[PDB]
Write a protein that binds this DNA or RNA. Sequence first.
DNA 1: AAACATGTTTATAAACATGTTT
DNA 2: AAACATGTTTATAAACATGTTT
Lengths: 195, 193, 196, 192
Amino acid sequence: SPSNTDYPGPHSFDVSFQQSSTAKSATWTYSTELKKLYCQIAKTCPIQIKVMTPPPQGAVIRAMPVYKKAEHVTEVVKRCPNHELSREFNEGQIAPPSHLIRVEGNSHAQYVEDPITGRQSVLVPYEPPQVGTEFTTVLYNFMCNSSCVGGMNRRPILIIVTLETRDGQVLGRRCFEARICACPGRDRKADEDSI
Amino acid sequence: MASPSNTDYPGPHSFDVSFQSATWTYSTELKKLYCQIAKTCPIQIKVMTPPPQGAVIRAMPVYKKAEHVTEVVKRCPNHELSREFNEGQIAPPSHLIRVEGNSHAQYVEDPITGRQSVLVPYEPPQVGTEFTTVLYNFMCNSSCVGGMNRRPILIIVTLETRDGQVLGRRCFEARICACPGRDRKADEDSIRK
Amino acid sequence: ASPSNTDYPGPHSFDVSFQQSSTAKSATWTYSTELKKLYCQIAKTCPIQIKVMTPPPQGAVIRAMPVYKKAEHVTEVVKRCPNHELSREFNEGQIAPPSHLIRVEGNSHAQYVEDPITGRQSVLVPYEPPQVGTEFTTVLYNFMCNSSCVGGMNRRPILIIVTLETRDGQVLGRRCFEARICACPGRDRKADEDSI
Amino acid sequence: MASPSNTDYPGPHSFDVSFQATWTYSTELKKLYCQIAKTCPIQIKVMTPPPQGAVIRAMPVYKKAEHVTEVVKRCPNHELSREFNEGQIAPPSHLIRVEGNSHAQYVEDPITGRQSVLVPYEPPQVGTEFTTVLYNFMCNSSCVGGMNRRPILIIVTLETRDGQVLGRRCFEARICACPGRDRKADEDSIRK
DNA sequence: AAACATGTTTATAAACATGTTT
DNA sequence: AAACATGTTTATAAACATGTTT
Ligand SMILES: [Zn+2]
Ligand SMILES: [Zn+2]
Ligand SMILES: [Zn+2]
Ligand SMILES: [Zn+2]
């Protein structure tokens, strides 16, 4: 299984989320001390990338899902069959109906599965912020609820975004739990009460 | 052309269907069958004069709401592809309604309407019995995402002639779920408005 | 392959049967004819009647072997549970291997055997014709583990396979019957009868 | 010698035992009802600190005189089972085990053949009034081959580093399948 | 024999978790 | 959001099966 350990690296690589509009019906929200994303299915979710020094030639940013619990870590993460086949979300998407993770607003994006692992992930060429901007925004879409039967089956997962060299070297990586549900607002308020 | 009818029609042979926290339960006041997925479901048929020769009983599911009638009812992709319930089995894996215990049961998909249904040759009751029994199994919960997506359905059981002329028709709403008992009691308290 | 339980009267019209089952409510054993099933308490002796219409061969013998009733289990040797195999109780000064489920009492020539390859256990007795004026040869069998014995039969129904053989193991006839070793044969048998 | 004593003896340190479902304890019948191998929390209480190598021994013994002379052990079935016996420091025969303590030491008297398990005594956590020991019982009271439904007592003894008994408390233990059911049973049974 | 004892199974019912509708 | 809807998981109680005691 792939590594899920925070490694800032040579470019002080960092992933973060802008203000999570706590306005009750927020399409997504992020608990900072739970290191957890609560996101509605398919809704666009913006991620902030910061680097302390410019990364290499054609570096890239990959996002890969994986289960949190040890008993499952071995199993790939993809869209439950019902969602892989249904008409919605698939209309005419340049992504494979299997991949739980999609990127938005970036035609240079490229999806991929590994023959040896059969692990699914999406890659995007790194691109420095625009003038007077501190972050580089990547737009993500999560295609299955974390409770789809025949898929995540209510099994927690976590996103492992990593920065890499044009040819695979791991320049840095960060991770956060991701619960893609219907009421990120409620499911977060509640999780913050279990303690 | 139009969506299959759902109006009760006893017909020349006075054709009628009826039912005898168990596997299922049937509300007569709501004419609605509550039942667990894939569990066996006994339906009693009754005629007052013998149907013709190759007379058959066909069961077809159709959405209840006008908003959905035109869409064929089928199993959700999950279940249609799952090995569970489809291993040793002659029913095409997509058909919602199957009938167990009758080798002559034939499943059919309309070549033009795309609609699916299962027939069973008509056979009078056993001697000293007043009811011919048919055993249905329903293969998807009403709530199956990808399938019924919780849209209610009607079961249209129709007595026909060897060559598909309808001679009788009875209909009932079917709610395949995990807790027929609970849910039925819910619907019953709901009208206790 | 898992030993044959097919009824086969053979050339000598081999047949096993039971005398009065004395119901008594407290019998040490009882036998249902309609269920072909023997009910009997652990270790209590069990008289079984053998009949033949023509004398069997020379070294002709009678072997009794337990085997599981259900296909799902038929491949597992039937033996005593560890508890009873290790216990001093019943193994006191017996000539019989402590692991063997079926024993025979009142016969010095009785001989226990484990198949080197199959590892199956059985007990044989040299067949002897009945005493003068008696129609049946009698064989006293003992069953050393209840059925519900944990780590042993663990409530898995068995069948006993009594067989008539030639001195050299050729089967001359074979009969079978289920065998439920319990504490209240009277109750359990009535139970099975109401059940139907 | 004679069979191990079972009379409560608080002793110089006011040694006492108590209990705060997988288990339940009847105070009127001084009896513990609990499921097999499941974890059992027992609360030790003293009023002054015991000596140095002070230990807490737990030893099981038959309740009835008809059986006291017999050592209480696991039935051959469980003793030989892979179940509960895989990675274990406790001998597979020992009925009582202690979980959550690497210092726990199992002993079998060379002469009496009796088996128990000791745990070094350590005072409660700061702000806590009780030292807690976690015990596991590896056979059902009913195990054929073993207890064979014969009732047993648990003799928890506070001892000197060299085994001189300093304190002693006892309680009957019934390891069964439904502690709730059985306790209610005995309870209704005496209410008669 | 009748009543009890005691580990397993079966049945019922709440409590959960989480998506949709009012 | 507040309420509901609807499959799962947990908790409880009965019912069983079967050996012992009275
Ligand atoms: Zn999905
Ligand atoms: Zn389905
Ligand atoms: Zn045994
Ligand atoms: Zn045991």
